Design a protein around this ligand. Structure first.
Ligand code: G52
Ligand code: CL
Ligand code: CL
Lengths: 99, 99
């Protein structure tokens, strides 16, 4: 797609088989999802944001399906006001910002 | 431009006459800059992101120049780990995310 930015750029995604909605976020290095549960081992990440840091779970090697594209990536699970798809996923799509 | 996303999408911007560097951030509604000083009245604001909220100041009617484009927008001044250009500016450029 070609997505305009006069509203928040939400997309439906499937992450580890779980369908959720998330914001395409070029300011996020990582993909951060609150409302999913993933199985297995994870690595504590102190993740940083505008409000401070928090301790979360980094899960690796997760299947991610977005607008027909199928990629593998790391997914951070923890509290976030909105789920975000970061550049670790968008760069695998070849996504660009255009103006 | 067409900007890829395998590194952070920083651009040089002039805000209120001040040149700084900022991240093009589709997950930011607003433009948040730490290292500038703007004159005059402002509105207190609270914004929320990963890690919680933070209190900031909102200046209106600020001239913003980015890659040859000249727009007027509101600018939030306050602590942010990275300066971000949000959709309030990018939508005025007709920017799109493409993949
Ligand atoms: C209302 O208007 C707003 C309100 C909120 C924000 S924000 O900065 O909180 N944020 C909104 C988003 C959480 C829905 C914009 C994001 O693009 C921030 C922008 C941001 C960047 C860096 C630091 C703080 C904020 N990115 C961010 O929180 O990234 C996290 C996740 O991945 C990591 O990459 C980043 O780089 C390493 C740390 C962060 C981690 C901006 C304008
Ligand atoms: Cl990844
Ligand atoms: Cl504005």
């Amino acid at each position: 797609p070609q997505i305009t930015l006069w509203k928040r750029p939400f997309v439906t995604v499937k992450i580890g088989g779980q369908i959720t909605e998330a914001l395409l976020d070029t300011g996020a290095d990582d993909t951060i999802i609150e409302n999913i549960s993933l199985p297995g081992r994870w690595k504590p990440k102190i993740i940083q944001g505008i409000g401070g840091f928090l301790k979360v779970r980094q899960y690796d090697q997760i299947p991610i399906e977005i607008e027909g594209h199928k990629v593998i990536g790391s997914v951070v699970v923890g509290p976030t006001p909105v789920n975000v798809i970061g550049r670790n996923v968008m760069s695998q799509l070849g996504a660009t910002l255009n103006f």
